[model samples]
Structure formats: structure tokens, C-alpha cells
Target: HMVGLIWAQATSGVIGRGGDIPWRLPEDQAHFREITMGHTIVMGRRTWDSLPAKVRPLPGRRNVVLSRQADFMASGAEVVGSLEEALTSPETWVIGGGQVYALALPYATRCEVTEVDIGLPREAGDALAPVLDETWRGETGEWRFSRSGLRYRLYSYHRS
Candidate 1:
């Protein structure tokens, strides 16, 4: 099984603001959809709730939601109460909030990052770059692009 993470972040490592992303990047969104299609996505309750109703159960993928709530129910997604339970997928995609990213990094095989140009200060928002150790390598360099005045690049990090 290959466990991975996919998220776009600002230069300052800010992944989201106000329970949602601070910037709008359609290209990143498309990239996410393309990569995660047919895969099992594992995410925190906050991340799940942040999604829109129409997109609640993200189309074309199996959604595994992490929540402590035993009665937690999502319309089109499976709710797992613990990380151990959510670790069952062969192709797991750890889509996140700060806490989820931090918790799942140890088991992740690769990380897909879209680095944006916007710089933000660490003002206690939801922003966390999975910290890599010696077991991981920056296998791919940045691939840059721009949209709506927002400059960004895609990078890949994976376990050695």
C-alpha cells in the first residue's frame, strides 16, 4: 500500500485560513482530483466538514473520515473513529488539516505539495508542512506555474 498526502500551501506554510483555504487555485484543485481519483482519501473531521455539501463525499473516491465521534455520520463517507481504523486502505491519501497531517506523516510514503507564492505569518492558523526525516527524499524539484496572479509550483517528496 502506498500512503500519500496531497495539499496546496502558501509560502509561509499556511494550508488554510478560517477553516478554509485562503487562496483559490483551480489548477491545484484539478491536480488534486486527477491524482486522487479512485483512491481512498483519509482526512480529519475538520477537513471533512470544511467541504461543501454537494461535494461532501468527494466524487470518484472513497472517503474515510477521522473523527472521535462514534456516532459521526457523513452522507457519502465512512467514518472511522481512530487512525488505526483509517489505515486500512491500500492506496491511502491523507488529505488534511494541521493535526491530521502531523499524525499521518509517519506512515506516509509520499507527499504531493503545491507551494503557492503567498506568504503568511504563523498566526495560529491551520498550516503544517509534513516534516521530513532522513527516511524521505525530495525526489522531484519544483514545477512552477501561475494563475490569477498567484505563482505556485508542484513538488514531490517520498520515502527512500
Candidate 2:
């Protein structure tokens, strides 16, 4: 299986803090579009609730929310009880939040992580990007700075 983490930076040391991400860039939007479309994007119940109402399940994706609850519901999402049920599909995207990432990393055949370079100085939140066995390699390069003011690169990895 493939595994890795991605993020963005304000300066070199600052990463994933409550930093302002310039989201208008077409590249980032394009990247997100590539995964969420047609694939099953999975996340936890809290992650599901955090999505903008108009942007539920994204525009063209099959969304599966992994909830510990028995009755959590959303218009376009099918809630599954565990990672095994969530991981059955060929194109599954374990999208976010700490617990979900940890559970999905071991079983994931590929991981696409986009890191934003701003980190929390000391303030803590509940998100963790996973690290995998070193043999997992990635498809990545130096930052492609965009016209719309966002710098990011997609890193894809695989095991063996």
C-alpha cells in the first residue's frame, strides 16, 4: 500500500496552523476535483458536519461517512460502521481528521497529501497526517506556484 502526508507552509517552520490558505488557485481546486469526482471520499462524522452545506459530498463524488453513531445521516452519503467496509472500493479517498487518517493509512494503497506550510506554534488541534513505511514512494516535485497565489504539490506514494 502507498502512504504519505501533504501540507502547506506560510514560512518554512509554520505549518497547518490556523493559517489563511489562498484557496482561489485553480490548481488546488483542480487537484481536489480530480480525487473527489467519481471516487468514494470518506471521512468521519465530525468532518462531514464541517463541510459547507452547499458543498456536501463535493459536486461529483460518492461520499461515505464513517460514524460511530447508528443514525447519522446526510443527503448524499452512506454511513459505514468501520474501515473495512469503507476500504472495499478501488477508488477510496480517506479525506480527513485525525482518527480517520490513522485508521485508513495502513490499509491504503495510495496516499495523496497536500501540505500547507504553516504549522501551529503551540496551539493544538486534532488533525494528524500519517507517516508510512519508507519504501512507499511518491510522485512529487518542487512547488508549482500558481497565478492565483497558492503554492502546493501533490505527493502520491505506493508500497514496494
Candidate 3:
């Protein structure tokens, strides 16, 4: 069972400003909790480095870092250079950084996406997830949601 989770922040705004997207509304927490609690999660070296020093490499699950450079060493995970190494675990997550998501867009089993409804500000950032391939399919929960005064939705994009 491979779980491919990708997301867009509720505001259509990607996290930025010197690791300053610090607000974790309930929906985002819920999304992370669901992924990190039982199974292993894989991410790129840039994502590993971007994590706020406090929340390093999720607590209980294994964190696999994909990198060409071997400088950054985390406590509980191994570094693998390619996507194949990241996929070594029974169930793996390809966490973000635009390049990683772009490389992984097509090999996913299911995409757990968090979509927020705010209007687009700008597409200036380099870290973006891939658009859901209509060729790949999903089932969504009802759209009614409110978090920290921001209206949003949470759903599973179960790839078909």
C-alpha cells in the first residue's frame, strides 16, 4: 500500500519567508498525523533542511531523506539518492519540494491533498505540487470546512 500525499495550503499560498509559515491549523495537523503516525515518510534533502529545528524528522515514523550530498545526517533515517530508494519502505510518502513532487507525480498510488480556497496571490515559488492528473482519480469529502477563520476543505485523492 503506497500512499502518495501532496497538498496546497488553504490559502493557495505556499509556505515561505524564512521558515515563517508557522501556522498549523487543525486540518494540516490532521493531515500530518494521519501520514506520520504509523508508516514511514520520505522527503528530499531540501525539505529535511527546511523543517523548523523544533520539528525535526517526525517523531515515531521513519524519515528517509533523498539526497545526492551526504552532509546532512538525521537521527533515525537513511539517505537514498533516488526515488527507488525512497520507495523501499512498504508504504512511503513523497513529501514536497517542487522538484521531488514533479519527479514523483506519476508514480503515486493515492494523493492525500489539502486544498484551500483563497485566491491565487502569485506562483513565484519553486516548491509546488503537481496538478492531479484527471487520468488519476479520487474521492472527496464534503466541502464544508472552517479553520482559524479560514474556510477550506479536506479530502483524499485516492488514485484510481
Candidate 4:
């Protein structure tokens, strides 16, 4: 079983702001869908809530949401109280908000990151990407410019 963490972050390592991703890149969205389809995706309640209603459960994947609130329930998804409970499959991808990514980082076997070349002010976004330390080695791809004129690159990381 492999535990993977996937996210797209700004150059400043900001992953989110105001309960949503700070930028719009359909390319990244398609990449996310391609990688996570048919897999088990575990995310925090906030991440789940941030999803659009039409794709709330994220079609073609097993959606598991972690919420500390015992009474929390989401449509078409399994609601678990802890990460341990959510991560029961042979393969699980930890999708995120800041706190969830931080908690799952230590346990992650692989990481799929899209680095967007844009800087946000410190107060612009509340969520940050987990810093990959010396234990991880990354293989980065060439930067590709998005239709929206942002340059980004996809990276794959594994424990070194």
C-alpha cells in the first residue's frame, strides 16, 4: 500500500486561501483527476467542503473525509473521525488543506506536486504546502505555461 500526497502550490508554498485554492488552472485540475481517478482519496472536511457540489464526491474515486466532529456527514462519501480510519485502502492519496497535508506528510510514501510560479503575499493564503525535507528526492519535469499564462511544473517525489 502506498500513501501519496498530492497538491499544487504557489511559489510561496501557498496551497489555499479563503477556503479555496488561490489560483485557477484547468491543467492542474485535469492532472489531478488523471492521477487520482479510481483511487482512494482521503481529505479533511474543509477540503471536501471546498469542492464544488457537482463534484463533491469526485466521481470515479473512493472519497473519504476526515472530520473531528462526530456528527459530520457528507453525501456520497465516507466520513471518518481520524486519518487512521480514512486510510484503510491499499492505496490512498491525501488531498488537502494545510493541516491535513501536514499530518499526512510523515506517512506519505510518494508526492505529486505541481509548482506554480507565482508568489502570494503572506496574508493572501492561510494554507501552506508541506516542506519536503532531506529525506525526500524529487524528479521534476520541464515547466509548462498554462493557458492562463502561469508557468508550472509537475514533480514526483519519493523518500530517499
Candidate 5:
């Protein structure tokens, strides 16, 4: 499988706070849809719950939610207890709230990140994404953009 992760985060690598995104960037949202469309995305139960009712299982994508409870059931999503079980797709995106991303990082082949220019205090949010290590190769060449008056850049990286 082509294991990868996609997320929009602040400069501090904070993806979410209290199950909510601390910033607004419509372009980043669109970027997520553009990339993950027609692919499988595995997320944790808390991330699934953070979604709205109308789109609990995001449209145009296969939703696999990881939960510890064997009896846990969610609408329009496949609930798996472990990442190993959840990873059934040839191309899987480990979209997360925190812990899931951490567990999946070692297996990730690529990373699609939207680096927002906002900063959040570490104590402001417990949720975070994994840091890109020195072993990863990043694409760099003036591919920055702005949305909602916020400057951001889309970065794609592969493990070196």
C-alpha cells in the first residue's frame, strides 16, 4: 500500500484543539478534497466524531475509522480496532487527531501538508501531527499560496 498522511496544521504542527481546527482556511479544505478524493482515509473515532452529521463519513472517499471498542459502530464508515486491520487499501491516508498519526508515521511513504502561518500555544491543544524527520525529502520551490488572508504552503515529502 502507498501509505501517506494529509493534514492542515499551524506552524506549531497542531492539527486540532479540543476536536476542532483552530483556524479557517478554505483553500486547505479544498486541497484535502482534491487529493483524497476516490481514495481510502483511515482516521480515529474522535476524528470521525469531530465531523459534522451530514458528512460523518466524508463523501467520495472510503472512510475507515479506528476504534478500540469491538462493538463500536459508526454510520457510513468501517470501524476497525487496529491500524493493521484498517489498512486495507492500496493507497491509504492516515488522517488523524493525534495518536493515530503517530502510530502510522513509521509506515508512511509520503506526506501532504498544508503549513499555516498561525501559531498556537502547546498547552492550547493536545492534538498534533508528527514532525517531518531529517530522513524525509521535501519539495521546495516557491509553491506558496494564501487563503482567507492567511499565508500557507502545500508541501509534499517522501521518506529518503
Candidate 6:
């Protein structure tokens, strides 16, 4: 199976704040939907909890939540005990909190990143984008302005 990671981050690598995404970009949301609409999405328990109750299952995709609790349960998603177990499907995307991203880094072959132009202090968010070393080559797209007036660019990275 191929593992992919996806997220939108601020210039300082901030992905979330207080258990929620700090910024809003409808275009990025659409981009995420387009990329993982039919694929399996794996996320940490915290990530699952951060989602709104109504969109708990994030319709149109297979949701898999990774948790260590023996009795952990996600309403409409599959619960797995480990990263390996969560990745049983043919194609999996780790759409996550910081810890999950770190754990899945070694197995991730590609990354779909949205770089928001705003720069934030590290302490502003508790979650961050995974750090990619030199082995991962990235191709970045031209920056585009969002309807909300935020400048952002999409980056596609592949492990070499």
C-alpha cells in the first residue's frame, strides 16, 4: 500500500491551534476533498475529536482513526490500534495531528502540502506540519490568493 500525508500549514509550520485549524481556506478544503475523496484517511484520535460532530465521518471517504485505547471508538470510522494496522488498505492518507504525522513519516511516500503565507509563532499552535528531510523532493506550485485574501501555494513532495 502507498502512504500519503496531507495538511495545510502556516509559514512557521503551524497546522492547528487549540485542537482546531487556525485558518480557513475553502479552496484548500476542496483540494483536500478532491485528493482523498475515495481513499482511506488515517488520523489520530485527537484529530478525529477535533472534527465537528456532524462531519464526524467526513462523508465520501473511508475514515480510520488510530488510538491506543483498548475500547476506543469513532462513530462512523474504523478504529485501529497502530499505524501498521490502520494502513491495511491499498492507498492510505495520513491526515493528522502532530504525533500521527511523526509516526507515519517513515512510511509516507508522498506529501500534499498547502503552505499558507501567514507566519505564526511556534507557540501559537500545538500541532505542526511534519518536517521533511532532504530525501523528499518537492515541487511547489505558483501562489494563489484565496477568497479570504490569504496567499497560499500547493506543494507536492515525493520521497527519493
The top-ranked prediction according to lDDT is: 6
Note the Cα lDDT for every prediction shown. 0.83, 0.63, 0.66, 0.89, 0.84, 0.91
TM-score of 1: 0.92
Candidate 1 residue-wise lDDT, 1-160, digit = tens: 7789888878778887788888888767778988899999999999999999977888889999999988898879999987778878688898997889999887888889888888776676556666667887775456556666787887788874
Off by over 4 Å in 1: 139-143
For model 2, give the RMSD to the true fold: 3.8
Higher-ranked by TM-score: 5 or 6: 6
Which is better, 1 or 2, measured by lDDT? 1
What is the TM-score of candidate 4? 0.95
**Which sections of candidate 3 miss by over 4 Å?**
1-3, 10-23, 144-147
TM-scores for candidates 1 onward, in order = 0.92, 0.77, 0.81, 0.95, 0.92, 0.96
State the weakest 10-residue window (summed lDDT) of model 2.
Answer: 1-10
* Per-candidate alpha-carbon RMSD to the true structure: 1.6, 3.8, 2.7, 1.3, 1.7, 1.2
lDDT of 5 by residue, 1-160 (tens): 7789888888887888877888888766777888788999999899999999987789999999999998998899999989988777898998886889888988898888888877676765479878777888988435455656777887888883
| Clash count, predicted structure 4 | 0
Clashes of each: 0, 20, 1, 0, 0, 0
Ranking by lDDT: 6, 4, 5, 1, 3, 2
Question: In lDDT terms, how accurate is model 6?
Answer: 0.91
- Expressed as tens digits, the lDDT of each residue in 44-159 for candidate 6 is 99999999998889888899999999999799999999999988889999999899999999999999999999977789437888899989998999999999889999999998
Task: Give the clashing pairs for model 5.
Answer: none
lDDT winner between 3 and 4, please give it. 4
